[PDB]
Design a binder for these strands. Structure first.
Ligand SMILES: [Zn+2]
Lengths: 219, 241, 327, 326, 320, 287, 280
RNA sequence: GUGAACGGUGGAGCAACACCUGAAGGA
């Protein structure tokens, strides 16, 4: 069908450090609905490939979904967001004195331990997201209607989506090659933006055990 | 080098330690380097100290560390690779600003590893992917994993130089932070807004954090010319052994 | 599941922001160099999109309370007002690792990653408390979702689509409050005032002489002292905020636990500034899936949730937390 | 613990606000440039969200006493009249650093990187006095929280919900006052009153010639005679004050009750020479129940016994060990 | 150490409030433009919270005497009636700067922000006169707190503690008084009179010509002023924090001859005349028809204190 | 030093009061406007607190002659019959500006802002005439204190604290009198309120650190002033009064012939008059 | 200068007072009940503080003749008997405005607010007549003071007690007459005292006053001329405390008579025109 | 199985000391 999906979100979201792939989001939604259907004790990897999307085939296996990575249109300048974590000394003191906490050390060790305080900073952006993919429409629209957030740090509440739209586009106006592709991919799909790197082309993109040499563009 | 730990196999010379174990049965990956441990390989059970806190960066829950990963965990070279670039011909230091300019403007043509430390002593070497192309550099800076394209850096530097022509005192169009933690990071100053077109503003807004962090070191008045880094591989070798 | 809590604050809200800011004696902030300036600490502020009266979007700041602070405060309230009394009543005692995992969600037990099984993963995600916040060395996913605290303001129109046509604040909602630190020794005025120090007049005179010597050293080096003068920005008290909570396919016990935590949540303080009694608030309304459940004396309704949470709280033991922390 | 105390001032309340303002002679504040103006000092003010009209809600200015000032005043009241008498009656005395830490909450203003032990923290947070006010080196947290002083005014309707639906005032609350500080010499005209002055007439005429010299120089340090103004709060108002404690020891709440019971003969904020800040306590409520009478507290027997027992066992080792660093 | 002075005034009391005000022939003040408008000055006024409706409290005016004015009156009575004899008869003479610091807080326009050692602070605070008034280059604290003078009026029910429910008065307690100024030359009316002054009749005619010229293109005047009616009760509150017996004795000594002086305002018509009726000291009335009965300890202490008074403390106080 | 002059009026006394009021033909307090209303000139009135009822004090009205009028009468009589003879016999010649300064206080408005010196201030405070009234371009303070003339009435008991326990009038002390200027403006019917004659009034005067010459001159002035009208009404010859008693510092001195005592003051002012120079007033009023 | 003349009436004296008063068949005045009310007219009255009850002071009524009417009577008798025949002789007519100014003070109802020159004031205050009675457009102040006519009664002791310890009457001095228009009058055969004062007068002015006093006896005081009320005779004129009255006239103070003879010998109408003229 | 998943910017400290709006005005 060669269609395109656009997403607008009211709440600013996390800025991804790597490419965010549409098929990954669809697989996460499929896993969520499978958990809702077949109970909680379910293997995540048995259902995450069952998506209404076509598959490209490299000359030697390495099949990847047609869906491409998300493109960003910035509405506001990027802003740094700071968070930190620490454990309260006073409450632990009271509990240890009351016997509710079994601890024998005299004072927290300055070299490290449970009571060490940490701080970190991450970018935050508010944008318009666009993606191109080839596949059925009704399943895609149902899955997207199931979703409620997008991006990282979803527990804190970032990246609440305002709306989405899916519309068919002409075959010449649906670039899905802006993606992670196998090394032996056809040079017609490969552009000058693609570069050789160790990354994941399929499934969970955060699993380092499945990373392989491939061609990917910078986000 | 498919996996990072390959450095200790090739860049420097070392062998398996004495007192390790042997693996049998189904293979598992090193919990640090994410490299499979096959039958007959030297490995050690995971016995990290109480000060370890990088559980989020662990690649596997097998609680086994291959001998190359074990050598990577050694303290003596932890402070020897605080700011370094590792290539097949050895290691070099990027602490100096000119070294960073050389790396981010005229990078070496071989696969390498780029590590920069944001503290006195932390584990960085075993959790950074090894790059295979010079157009897309991977740099590990503390808890951050940045992707830097030298051509974009060169374009931004050329634009800054072009806009700074015709003035008596150098002024930075955009404020950048070496620590990369302030709220003003990646924000355009009023002068840059006044003397750059909107296309320049959009280009400066749409760069990944690695480009901003790299530009912060060299996009200043005292412009550093690129200069080759210092070879320190022999000092690391004599310190470790 | 969707819970919306509308609250009103009685005292100014102060959430420290990490930056270096200076202010003058008068209102103007961030002066150019060349004039006397004092350090300043401002509240947390976020830039958001605004579409009012027209179709073009403008970037506008808005003062908010971070959602991480609210989540941690809710966790602390749930632990202190529910879990600890029941665990003490049963007599069960927690280990250091279990305590750290329950209160901080840290993975500083077995430092290395903990392999798990789907049976045990399902059992802990079915737990009334462990499944809500997850965490631990296993890094279990959390069933509880917490949003930030959003004041009902015009700048916040993008965040809230409709239903608040009234009670909308306009204009600034922040003000600067000053503070000076004095020197108690300089207030001494008689021998009876100094009859409590080791030595009478002589020690106090030596303190004066040391202070004046330090003053001359400062006036010569640049050409410690107790007294100081600083300022800090706070959000004006009295205004109204909205808070959003959700759960992903929750059991009745967890919902009852959240309701009880809210009922005891009215006692706690939102943010820092305890000495100045900042963060005080009252609950004005609670909506559960679009239905108002809040009343004068508490939450009237949700009987099955209360019975479920009572049945759950009648069976907590520390061994579950221990086996969850250590695997 | 949530004690609520309602008081009433019988002299004007003044609390200076940093900055500078100018007032014209007729009484407009911050007049446009080009008209004569005199320096003015304004009292402390906070903006509170309130309903102006029926439904539209805006920020309105209010007159209040900072909670920092009230907390410090409570500390000094409870410390000067109870801790010091029961302390100096024995041979116990404090160091200079101990005194500074007890009064100002700190010794030198420099924190220590080394933390303290759990047992020390749990012992200090149970002390009758140290547990109320944390601080010093290696700063700790006390279990006392002090709020500002709010007059019972319609602008503060949203801050305080019920219990005061009546006796709520409205309209202007502040008033401006002036002062001159004339020069005594210009008031001297009689020779029998200048016999004290060394030199007498010659010295007086020398000073007058100095004054004309100063006036000539200025038009081309400051004159004794001037004219200034400042703003105060009218007397007779009703104020409400709220103090809270979390999980307190009975001795601590007893000490708070003692300080409240002897809170009289005190000046709240400022204007000590002009007798500003005199007040009378006319209401105290303990968790919603009134525990005040015209004679005194007449309540909290368990708290009073506990605080008496605690002060009988008070000593100076704890203060010295808390104030000391390294 | 609380002192409550109950006084009565025999003449109108006039304290000039700052600000321009206008009056017409009737009682309307600050009229709409176009009415016959003449300058006016009014008595000092303060706003107080009152139960006018006994159900609602609001801000209402009340005529008072400022606290600073009566503080200065007390200081001047204390100084010119006690200190001057003690210095002159002992041969001790005072310098101009220390005199100004005695009369005024400082001898210079701008104070110096430099602290003083604690022993100096204690010594100067122990001083009988300098202790009460802390005005100095280092801004020393004083031991004396003075209040404004209040009438016994129902507007100030919430201010007065208790026991005044019987003698308290109501109604307006102020009046407007008119006055005019005329040119003497217009009232000569005799030849010998004009010849007495230089020039004579031709001089008078020339001055009338000058008056005509001034009128075409000036001592006649007419203006009013607002005063407080005589014969009403006033209350004064004074307090001292941890004072020595000498300071209390000095305060009582200055109070014992207080009645002679005039309250500030309206000297030329004898306005500030008043009679002291009672003096309560911590709840005990110690005023007689001629002075204070009791308190002999403070009297003896201050009598010892005045002996040995020296000017050395003044020059060691007010220098730089 | 309290000088007390107890006087009585032989004729009814009346003082002009600012403002205009109307009155009916017979009384009719608070009538509807437009009913036989005729213009009325009201005498000067002053409020005073009185013990009208047990435990209550009310602000009642009373009739006085203001202190400024009597101070001006003092100055005019004193400058008429004392200094003028010395000016005519010695051969002095005051200037017009000096004369105006002597009679009506300041010579002109807008006084010089700059002060002059302590020496001339001391000289003018030591002057017999300048010191008592002051004035001048430098706003020089006076030595005199003049109080208004108060009738001895039961209402003013709170003003007359001690003494005068008898001869306290009780009834109203005023009366409304009618007059028509018919054609022999012209043909006008009017009313006016006037104090009744034959009642006792008291005058209080004070001075601060007064010299003997000034006291003697003031005492000469009262004797000269016995023959004068306190308030306006020269055509009606209103204000004829007789001085009954004079108490000096609380002790009585008046007799039928005059004051009995103070010859020291009299001779002191007599020698003070000798040597009087017109230069004092010339330099004093010059700016 | 301080002339005090006593007089005696031979007919009742009536001086109607504005107001409304009622009588009931002569029995009572202003009864609380509205029964048998009749209208009554009262003579002019004056409250005076007097000693009643032997120790306390009270206000008591006293029947007088107002000083305004006496001053007008003096002006008219002096203007008709003395000034008018001297003026009309040898020509010297007056204008209508000057006539009105001489008889009633001002000539119009509105005075100009302008002042007058010093020379005009000096010359007018020296005129034998204009200096006595002031007035005019610019409101000149005269030097003649006329008191009211007081009966020598025990009620007026605080006014004139020292002079007349004896020869003071007591009791009511008023009688009500029906002719049904009822009014009250002062009974005849009574002794009154009249006080007149001048300040810094010339001898001509005192002479003119004495001349007017000589011819005054043929005039009438207040009263209703139709009912022949108000006749009186003059005796006991005392000048500055000295008795200068005889049965045939004054016969004393000859300097005043010579001065007034010289002054009225040379009177002219130019001064009247200058005084009456209004420079508006 | 969103390069997901886990993480509270927190504790403590007084704005204030000293200061007169008044000198001279009606018959
Ligand atoms: Zn490895």
């Amino acid at each position: 069908v060669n269609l395109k999906v656009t997403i607008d979100l009211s709440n600013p979201m996390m800025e991804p450090g790597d490419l965010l792939h549409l098929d990954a989001l669809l697989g996460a939604l499929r896993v969520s609905r499978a958990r809702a259907e077949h109970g909680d004790a379910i293997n995540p990897r048995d259902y995450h490939y069952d998506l209404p999307l076509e598959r490209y085939q490299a000359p030697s296996g390495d099949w990847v979904f047609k869906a491409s990575a998300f493109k960003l249109k910035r509405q506001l300048p990027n802003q740094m967001w700071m968070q930190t974590g620490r454990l309260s000394i006073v409450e632990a003191a009271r509990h240890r004195q009351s016997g509710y906490l079994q601890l024998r050390a005299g004072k927290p060790n300055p070299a490290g331990g449970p009571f060490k305080t940490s701080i970190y900073h991450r970018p935050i952006v508010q944008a318009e997201l666009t993606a191109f993919c080839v596949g059925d429409q009704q399943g895609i629209e149902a899955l997207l209607s199931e979703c409620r957030q997008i991006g990282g740090k979803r527990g804190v509440g970032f990246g609440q989506v305002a709306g989405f739209k899916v519309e068919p586009v002409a075959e010449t106006d649906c670039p899905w090659s802006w993606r992670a592709l196998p090394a032996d991919a056809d040079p017609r799909l490969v552009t000058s933006e693609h570069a050789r790197c160790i990354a994941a082309i399929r499934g969970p993109y955060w699993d380092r055990t499945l990373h392989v040499e491939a061609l990917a563009p910078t986000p | 080098m498919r996996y990072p730990s390959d450095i200790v196999d090739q860049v420097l010379k070392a062998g398996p330690d004495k007192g390790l174990l042997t693996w049998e049965g189904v293979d598992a990956a090193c919990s640090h380097c994410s490299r499979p441990i096959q039958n007959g390989d030297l490995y050690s059970p995971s016995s990290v100290g109480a000060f370890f806190s990088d559980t989020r960066d662990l690649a596997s829950t097998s609680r086994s560390i291959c001998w190359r990963c074990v050598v990577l965990r050694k303290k003596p070279m932890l402070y020897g690779l605080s700011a370094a670039v590792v290539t097949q011909d050895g290691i070099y230091s990027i602490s100096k600003d000119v070294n960073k300019a050389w790396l981010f403007t005229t990078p070496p043509p071989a696969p390498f590893l780029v590590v920069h430390s944001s503290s006195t002593m932390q584990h960085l070497s075993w959790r950074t992917p090894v790059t295979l192309d010079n157009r897309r550099i991977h740099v590990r800076y503390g808890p951050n994993l940045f992707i830097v394209r030298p051509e974009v850096v060169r374009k931004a530097l050329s634009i800054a130089d072009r806009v700074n022509e015709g003035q008596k005192k150098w002024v930075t169009p955009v404020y950048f932070d070496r620590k990369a933690a302030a709220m003003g990071h990646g924000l355009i100053t009023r002068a840059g807004a006044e003397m750059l077109t909107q296309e320049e503003q959009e280009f400066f807004q749409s760069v990944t954090p690695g480009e901003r962090w790299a530009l912060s070191y060299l996009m200043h008045s005292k412009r550093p010319e690129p200069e080759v880094g210092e070879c320190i591989t022999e000092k690391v070798m004599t310190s470790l052994n | 599941m969707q819970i919306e809590v509308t609250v009103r604050n009685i005292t100014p809200i102060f959430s420290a922001a990490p930056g270096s800011n200076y202010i003058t004696i008068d209102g103007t902030i961030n002066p150019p160099p060349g004039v006397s300036r004092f350090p300043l600490v401002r509240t947390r502020m976020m830039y958001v999109a605004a579409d009012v009266g027209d179709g073009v979007i403008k970037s506008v700041p808005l003062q908010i309370v971070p959602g991480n602070t609210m989540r941690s405060l809710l966790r602390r309230t749930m632990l202190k007002h529910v879990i600890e009394p029941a665990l003490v009543e049963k007599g069960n005692k927690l280990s250091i690792g279990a305590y750290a995992t329950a209160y901080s969600g840290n993975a500083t037990g077995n430092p290395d990653g903990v392999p798990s099984s789907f049976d045990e993963i399902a059992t802990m995600r079915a737990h009334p408390f462990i499944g809500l916040f997850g965490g631990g060395p296993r890094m279990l996913e959390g069933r509880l979702m917490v949003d930030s605290l959003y004041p009902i303001h015009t700048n916040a129109e993008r965040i809230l689509g409709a239903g608040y046509e009234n009670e909308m604040m306009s204009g600034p909602i922040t003000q600067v409050v000053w503070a000076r630190r004095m020197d108690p020794i300089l207030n001494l005025g008689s021998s009876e005032d100094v009859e409590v120090i080791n030595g009478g007049a002589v020690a106090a005179n030596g303190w004066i002489q040391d202070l004046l010597a330090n003053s001359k050293a400062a006036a010569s080096k640049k050409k410690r002292g107790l007294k100081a003068f600083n300022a800090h920005e706070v959000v004006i008290p009295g205004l109204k905020w909205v808070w959003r909570i959700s759960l992903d396919r929750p059991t009745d016990a967890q919902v009852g636990l959240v309701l009880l935590a809210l009922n005891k949540m009215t006692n706690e303080r939102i943010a820092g500034g305890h000495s100045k009694d900042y963060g005080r608030f009252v609950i004005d309304g609670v909506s559960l899936n679009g239905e108002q459940v809040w009343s004068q004396s508490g939450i009237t309704g949700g009987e099955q949730y209360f019975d479920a949470v009572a049945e759950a709280i009648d069976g907590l033991s520390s061994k579950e937390f221990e086996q969850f922390a250590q695997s």
